[PDB]
Design a protein around this motif. Structure first.
Motif, PDB file in Angstrom:
ATOM      1  N   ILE A 152      -0.221 -10.545  23.884  1.00 46.73           N
ATOM      2  CA  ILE A 152       0.806  -9.602  23.138  1.00 46.73           C
ATOM      3  C   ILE A 152       0.539 -10.156  21.590  1.00 46.73           C
ATOM      4  O   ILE A 152       0.289 -11.363  21.236  1.00 46.73           O
ATOM      5  CB  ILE A 152       1.982  -9.994  23.444  1.00 46.73           C
ATOM      6  N   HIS A 153       1.589  -9.107  20.611  1.00 47.56           N
ATOM      7  CA  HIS A 153       1.419  -9.787  19.106  1.00 47.56           C
ATOM      8  C   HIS A 153       2.262 -10.406  18.789  1.00 47.56           C
ATOM      9  O   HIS A 153       2.091 -11.701  18.264  1.00 47.56           O
ATOM     10  CB  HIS A 153       0.862  -8.808  18.490  1.00 47.56           C
ATOM     11  N   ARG A 154       3.661 -10.305  19.072  1.00 44.55           N
ATOM     12  CA  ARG A 154       4.274 -11.021  19.071  1.00 44.55           C
ATOM     13  C   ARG A 154       5.493 -10.930  17.227  1.00 44.55           C
ATOM     14  O   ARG A 154       6.354 -11.036  17.085  1.00 44.55           O
ATOM     15  CB  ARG A 154       4.300 -12.418  18.681  1.00 44.55           C
ATOM     16  N   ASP A 155       4.292 -10.424  16.292  1.00 47.96           N
ATOM     17  CA  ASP A 155       4.840 -10.454  14.865  1.00 47.96           C
ATOM     18  C   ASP A 155       4.222  -9.511  14.441  1.00 47.96           C
ATOM     19  O   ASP A 155       3.989  -9.150  12.764  1.00 47.96           O
ATOM     20  CB  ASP A 155       4.113 -11.530  14.607  1.00 47.96           C
ATOM     21  N   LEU A 156       4.359  -8.209  14.937  1.00 45.25           N
ATOM     22  CA  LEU A 156       3.899  -6.994  14.226  1.00 45.25           C
ATOM     23  C   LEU A 156       5.124  -6.829  13.319  1.00 45.25           C
ATOM     24  O   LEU A 156       6.057  -6.608  13.696  1.00 45.25           O
ATOM     25  CB  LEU A 156       3.943  -5.795  15.567  1.00 45.25           C
ATOM     26  N   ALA A 157       4.308  -5.817  12.151  1.00 45.40           N
ATOM     27  CA  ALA A 157       5.531  -5.656  10.609  1.00 45.40           C
ATOM     28  C   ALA A 157       4.464  -5.096   9.956  1.00 45.40           C
ATOM     29  O   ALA A 157       2.739  -5.612   9.844  1.00 45.40           O
ATOM     30  CB  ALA A 157       5.422  -6.760  10.208  1.00 45.40           C
ATOM     31  N   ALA A 158       4.781  -4.202   8.679  1.00 42.92           N
ATOM     32  CA  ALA A 158       3.792  -3.696   7.613  1.00 42.92           C
ATOM     33  C   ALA A 158       3.471  -4.877   6.715  1.00 42.92           C
ATOM     34  O   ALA A 158       2.519  -4.990   6.129  1.00 42.92           O
ATOM     35  CB  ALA A 158       4.921  -3.225   7.224  1.00 42.92           C
ATOM     36  N   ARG A 159       4.137  -6.582   6.468  1.00 38.92           N
ATOM     37  CA  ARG A 159       3.027  -7.420   6.012  1.00 38.92           C
ATOM     38  C   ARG A 159       2.314  -8.170   6.998  1.00 38.92           C
ATOM     39  O   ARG A 159       1.075  -8.254   5.919  1.00 38.92           O
ATOM     40  CB  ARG A 159       3.840  -8.757   6.127  1.00 38.92           C
ATOM     41  N   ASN A 160       1.872  -7.196   8.266  1.00 34.01           N
ATOM     42  CA  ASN A 160       0.317  -7.722   9.586  1.00 34.01           C
ATOM     43  C   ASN A 160      -0.695  -6.566   9.354  1.00 34.01           C
ATOM     44  O   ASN A 160      -0.415  -6.980  10.592  1.00 34.01           O
ATOM     45  CB  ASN A 160       1.401  -8.524  10.627  1.00 34.01           C
ATOM     46  N   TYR A 179       0.682  -0.890   0.015  1.00 32.42           N
ATOM     47  CA  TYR A 179      -0.165   0.067   0.105  1.00 32.42           C
ATOM     48  C   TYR A 179       1.069   1.176  -0.150  1.00 32.42           C
ATOM     49  O   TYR A 179       0.328   2.003  -0.624  1.00 32.42           O
ATOM     50  CB  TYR A 179      -0.773   0.274   1.108  1.00 32.42           C
ATOM     51  N   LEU A 180       1.649   0.787   0.862  1.00 31.04           N
ATOM     52  CA  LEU A 180       2.691   2.271   0.743  1.00 31.04           C
ATOM     53  C   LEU A 180       3.285   1.961  -0.400  1.00 31.04           C
ATOM     54  O   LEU A 180       3.657   3.799  -0.653  1.00 31.04           O
ATOM     55  CB  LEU A 180       4.037   2.065   1.839  1.00 31.04           C
ATOM     56  N   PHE A 233       7.823   4.939   7.912  1.00 31.18           N
ATOM     57  CA  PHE A 233       8.068   5.644   6.534  1.00 31.18           C
ATOM     58  C   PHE A 233       9.699   5.753   6.282  1.00 31.18           C
ATOM     59  O   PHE A 233       9.983   7.167   5.346  1.00 31.18           O
ATOM     60  CB  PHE A 233       8.400   7.038   8.237  1.00 31.18           C
ATOM     61  N   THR A 234       9.806   4.368   5.926  1.00 30.30           N
ATOM     62  CA  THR A 234      10.212   4.753   4.740  1.00 30.30           C
ATOM     63  C   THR A 234       9.035   4.487   3.127  1.00 30.30           C
ATOM     64  O   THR A 234       9.569   3.081   2.584  1.00 30.30           O
ATOM     65  CB  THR A 234      11.398   3.792   3.925  1.00 30.30           C
ATOM     66  N   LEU A 235       8.037   4.204   3.131  1.00 26.65           N
ATOM     67  CA  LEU A 235       7.228   3.788   2.182  1.00 26.65           C
ATOM     68  C   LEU A 235       7.103   2.441   1.540  1.00 26.65           C
ATOM     69  O   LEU A 235       7.354   2.557   0.755  1.00 26.65           O
ATOM     70  CB  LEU A 235       7.135   4.887   1.118  1.00 26.65           C
ATOM     71  N   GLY A 236       7.433   1.683   2.671  1.00 28.69           N
ATOM     72  CA  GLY A 236       7.462   0.156   2.546  1.00 28.69           C
ATOM     73  C   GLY A 236       8.910  -0.361   2.613  1.00 28.69           C
ATOM     74  O   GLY A 236       8.625  -1.532   1.395  1.00 28.69           O
TER      75      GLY A 236
END
Length: 304
Positions: A163-171, A115-116, A237-240
């Motif tokens: 706790i999520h444990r797998d936070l990341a743009a892909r998620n 998306y970014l 902030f690096t747009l993906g």
């Protein structure tokens, strides 16, 4: 437990009839499962005759026991955390007499990284990308707004002692209306009434998003999610962009011990970069909480 001998118990408040679910086009296929678009007739209590577009998570043909276990665990976690505007919400499940279908809100603009990347400023787009959306290019304000919504989702999550444990743009997924939604709760855990979650020696958490206590001390707390959130900010902030560019995970271990941290993203303010750096404090208790991040981010977004 043991998924090869476990019969999924009935849970009528979440159960959805198979004959009212119509599977459509694939949305995603990972190593451990699959997600398809579907029309679910009557899933919205308000419009019992109306079909609503939903996403359905299910096993693949080559599923492992752990894959099934992960799918059950994700479903159960979503029942327990409850509803929030910035989390992919559970809508229903088909659990009896057939494959396990976990039905959740559909996010029509897809994963956050792509998306970014489609919404980057021209020229950094080299080469030729047919998937760009120049009419929706990201402003600084959009990026801060993106971070704020995700911070709100994690604030709510932490408040449920999850706790999520797998936070990341892909998620992270993005809805038709540009709402940021935390997804993929397959690794999430309930830490109610325990001081921390105990990691295995070699875990299943992507290394470039893992806090050091988890990597080296086998402990996971809400403050470890905060570390990950900092990496997510950097992705936003690096747009993906992908983290620790040029550094293989095998070299990252020692670099982290030595205090290595990512550099400031090109079009980010020092204020936002410092917030990232605060999330990557070596001492977990010296990172901000999600509540403090929400307060800071709200203040920044207001000024803009």
């Amino acid at each position: 437990a043991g998924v090869s001998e476990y019969e999924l118990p009935e849970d009528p408040k979440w159960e959805f009839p198979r004959d009212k679910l119509t599977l459509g086009k694939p949305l995603g296929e990972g190593a451990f499962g699959q997600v398809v678009m579907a029309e679910a007739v009557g899933i919205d209590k308000d419009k019992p005759k109306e079909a609503v577009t939903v996403a359905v998570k299910m096993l693949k043909d080559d599923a492992t026991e752990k894959d099934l276990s992960d799918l059950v665990s994700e479903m159960e976690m979503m029942k327990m955390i409850g509803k929030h505007k910035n989390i992919i919400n559970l809508l229903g499940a088909c659990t009896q007499d057939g494959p396990l279908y976990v039905i959740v809100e559909y996010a029509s603009k897809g994963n956050l990284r792509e998306y970014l990347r489609a919404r980057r400023p021209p020229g950094m787009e080299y080469s030729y990308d047919i998937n760009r959306v120049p009419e929706e290019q990201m402003t600084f304000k959009d990026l801060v707004s993106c971070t704020y919504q995700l911070a709100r989702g994690m604030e709510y999550l932490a408040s449920q002692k999850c706790i999520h444990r797998d936070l990341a743009a892909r998620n992270v997924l993005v809805t038709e209306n540009n709402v940021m939604k935390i997804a993929d709760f397959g690794l999430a855990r309930d830490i109610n009434n325990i001081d921390y979650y105990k990691q295995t020696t070699n875990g299943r958490l992507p290394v470039k998003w893992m806090a050091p206590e988890a990597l080296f001390d086998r402990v996971y707390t809400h403050q470890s999610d905060v570390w990950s959130f900092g990496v997510l900010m950097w992705e936003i902030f690096t747009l993906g962009g992908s983290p620790y560019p040029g550094i293989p995970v095998e070299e990252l271990f020692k670099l982290l011990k030595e205090g290595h941290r990512m550099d400031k993203p090109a079009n980010c303010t020092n204020e936002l970069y410092m917030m990232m750096r605060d999330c990557w404090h070596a001492v977990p208790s010296q990172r901000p909480t999600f509540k403090q991040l929400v307060e800071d981010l709200d203040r920044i977004l207001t000024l803009t």
